[PDB]
Amino acid sequence: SAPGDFGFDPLGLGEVPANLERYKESELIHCRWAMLAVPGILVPEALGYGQEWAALPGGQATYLGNPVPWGTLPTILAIEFLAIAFVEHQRSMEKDPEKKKYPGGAFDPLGYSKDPKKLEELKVKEIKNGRLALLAFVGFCVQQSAYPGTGPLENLATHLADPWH
Amino acid sequence: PSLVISLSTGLSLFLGRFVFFNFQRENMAKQVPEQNGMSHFEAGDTRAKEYVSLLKSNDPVGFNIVDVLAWGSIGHIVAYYILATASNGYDPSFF
Amino acid sequence: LAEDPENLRWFVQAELVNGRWAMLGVAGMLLPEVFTSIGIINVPKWYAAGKEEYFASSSTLFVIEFILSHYVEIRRWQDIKNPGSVNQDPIFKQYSLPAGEVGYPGGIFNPLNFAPTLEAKEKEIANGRLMLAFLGFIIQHNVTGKGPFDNLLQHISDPWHNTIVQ
Ligand SMILES: CCCCCCCCCCCCO[C@H]1O[C@H](CO)[C@@H](O[C@H]2O[C@H](CO)[C@@H](O)[C@H](O)[C@H]2O)[C@H](O)[C@H]1O
């Protein structure tokens, strides 16, 4: 109920009209990577055999020498958060109208500034699928966010289980 | 179990972000501006602050971590030595 | 300087929803009294359908329905601040547009209107209460009992019972 109608400008609007949801576009493509991750299942009866980094047997190729720290996790991790600061640097150097430097004077006549630099530009369909995805990630994704030690084995009865520990 | 040098690796992540500027432009301390002697009026009650100067080496010396932190931490600090060891020196891999 | 009432929309609409649901509530009872035998709490479940599966549970039933009741109810909300319900027969009643000799304010006593053919939400006035206060009655007397009226042999005469609890 946060979007229960409220918000003015640079904070209110400004932060969000595309901006934060245009950054919540990442959320969806993360949940495109993650819903490029979960689809390990998605297709039943599939051909698999095996992989794929499962429960730690011996990483990439063991290295000719004692693995750096220990575990596959820290070696693949440490890098990820430096080689992707690439994008946000570029994504956090913009402005919406014309670009020069920190120029003369450009606030408002007609045309009214602009719109999220990358506005809707129409196609108000990204958002209709956006909050649709957000509502999912946050929502009944908690169908698999509680006690999911098991997996898929439905056996006929009904649906739902009320509340309980 | 504990990556102990997970994080001492980690903290001199950042204070080498400190080896910084003793070197590169001009003097020390962006030369003592205001320290001793007492900038009037402006040291007065105040200044300066600037939400606009978190760049400069964000990109360059964000490598400083992986320096010592790589090949000089878990991978046996400088094996390429020899340079006057007889009143002793060595120095010898506790690792 | 706002002398007195007021209110309006208010809890005249407050009522009729009591009235007409106390009315229904007692359709609840209606059943077990002529060809009689079956009720009280009877904590139903509640009429129960086929011999093809449930089975004590198949689900929180009860719990759900009224998630639905729920946005239908925001809907009547979704009416009474700003008048929107085609028929329009509760908010003042139907007879389309009118009654609102109390919609823009200034009441005091204002009786109201609303059936085209014909008369009114009026002698649906007092079936309105008969049933609210009836419930009052109805789940008054459980808390000790559960049945009405035989003949003049030995029932309707109240023989011997047992305090309130105490
Ligand atoms: C809505 C806002 C909150 C309400 C609180 C404020 C109430 C208003 C106070 C009234 C202001 C002064 O009003 C004042 O003038 C009247 C006439 O000019 C005077 O009234 C007097 O003169 C009349 C001459 O025939 C007599 O018939 C009256 O009985 C007599 O009371 C009083 O001195 C007083 O009533």
Side-chain angles (χ1 to χ4, degrees), chain A residues 1-72 74-123 126-165, chain B residues 1-48 50-95, chain C residues 2-7 9-166:
Chain A
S1 217
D5 290 301
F6 207 72
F8 173 62
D9 193 10
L11 30 56
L13 193 85
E15 257 267 282
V16 303
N19 282 24
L20 265 172
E21 279 75 283
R22 194 201 180 189
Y23 315 147
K24 282 170 187 190
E25 270 201 70
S26 91
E27 191 95 306
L28 320 176
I29 59 195
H30 299 312
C31 247
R32 283 187 171 176
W33 260 63
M35 217 40 169
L36 251 262
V38 190
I41 189 268
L42 265 283
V43 186
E45 133 278 293
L47 330 312
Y49 315 111
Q51 149 46 188
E52 300 92 84
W53 335 106
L56 287 77
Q60 292 165 305
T62 301
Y63 254 76
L64 27 289
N66 312 99
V68 201
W70 211 268
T72 312
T75 188
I76 65 92
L77 190 137
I79 310 296
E80 286 167 320
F81 292 105
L82 209 154
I84 256 162
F86 195 98
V87 56
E88 283 155 322
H89 137 62
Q90 309 280 220
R91 200 246 279 165
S92 195
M93 270 156 70
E94 49 165 310
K95 291 188 191 296
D96 318 67
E98 287 288 13
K99 34 216 272 76
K100 175 60 250 288
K101 41 154 88 177
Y102 59 115
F107 265 110
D108 245 281
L110 208 60
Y112 248 89
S113 221
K114 269 215 173 187
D115 20 36
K117 166 260 201 295
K118 204 292 105 166
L119 48 153
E120 266 103 44
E121 200 249 277
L122 277 177
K123 323 97 203 69
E126 285 205 344
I127 314 169
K128 254 62 195 182
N129 249 325
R131 96 147 203 91
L132 201 163
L134 304 173
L135 192 74
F137 163 78
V138 156
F140 50 79
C141 164
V142 76
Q143 287 164 342
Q144 298 161 243
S145 169
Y147 295 75
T150 189
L153 218 45
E154 290 162 323
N155 61 341
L156 211 165
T158 341
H159 48 268
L160 228 331
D162 226 12
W164 316 93
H165 294 180
Chain B
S2 307
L3 265 77
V4 329
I5 181 72
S6 84
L7 247 166
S8 173
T9 343
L11 202 76
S12 157
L13 292 164
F14 323 79
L15 25 150
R17 252 278 177 263
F18 266 85
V19 37
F20 198 57
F21 240 12
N22 63 308
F23 301 123
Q24 294 131 97
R25 101 210 81 28
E26 293 266 27
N27 55 220
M28 243 255 268
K30 250 26 290 131
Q31 55 257 45
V32 171
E34 278 289 357
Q35 272 120 221
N36 253 249
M38 264 33 159
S39 84
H40 59 346
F41 292 40
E42 63 129 0
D45 357 316
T46 128
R47 14 167 166 250
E50 66 208 298
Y51 207 56
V52 226
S53 183
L54 202 189
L55 342 125
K56 305 314 153 64
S57 206
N58 287 177
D59 343 293
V61 181
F63 199 73
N64 194 289
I65 298 85
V66 83
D67 308 358
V68 22
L69 193 146
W71 284 345
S73 321
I74 196 133
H76 84 293
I77 33 91
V78 294
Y80 99 113
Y81 193 56
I82 305 312
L83 188 64
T85 258
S87 55
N88 231 231
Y90 254 93
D91 259 27
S93 179
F94 333 99
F95 199 82
Chain C
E3 290 11 309
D4 258 33
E6 239 150 2
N7 90 20
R9 58 144 224 316
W10 145 255
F11 298 21
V12 154
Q13 201 97 348
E15 205 144 73
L16 91 99
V17 205
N18 287 107
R20 225 95 58 156
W21 253 327
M23 257 130 136
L24 274 89
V26 326
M29 166 285 279
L30 204 261
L31 69 137
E33 254 150 39
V34 197
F35 34 38
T36 54
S37 327
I38 259 187
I40 301 210
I41 53 171
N42 191 192
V43 59
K45 268 163 99 60
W46 86 153
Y47 153 35
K51 288 182 263 72
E52 271 316 328
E53 54 130 44
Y54 248 33
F55 207 130
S57 280
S58 307
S59 286
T60 181
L61 318 275
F62 146 20
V63 144
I64 271 155
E65 137 139 70
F66 317 34
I67 292 114
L68 207 144
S69 76
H70 167 20
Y71 41 77
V72 107
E73 303 145 24
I74 6 274
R75 142 251 83 212
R76 158 146 138 278
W77 192 294
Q78 259 188 185
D79 173 12
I80 34 63
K81 187 273 157 199
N82 287 334
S85 49
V86 66
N87 260 20
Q88 299 159 313
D89 334 6
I91 326 96
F92 66 132
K93 286 105 197 207
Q94 186 207 299
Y95 213 102
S96 272
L97 125 153
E101 72 188 348
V102 89
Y104 179 71
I108 284 72
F109 72 110
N110 260 176
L112 274 148
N113 183 36
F114 300 137
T117 259
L118 77 335
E119 274 209 350
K121 77 219 92 99
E122 19 167 280
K123 282 307 261 146
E124 294 216 286
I125 44 184
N127 308 36
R129 131 213 319 139
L130 217 260
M131 332 271 74
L132 45 68
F134 232 170
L135 180 103
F137 166 97
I138 265 156
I139 84 148
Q140 252 340 261
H141 283 133
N142 181 308
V143 214
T144 181
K146 48 79 211 63
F149 327 132
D150 201 305
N151 254 50
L152 196 84
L153 312 80
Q154 189 172 109
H155 158 27
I156 66 107
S157 37
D158 320 347
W160 78 332
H161 233 4
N162 59 8
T163 272
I164 292 77
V165 154
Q166 240 308 48

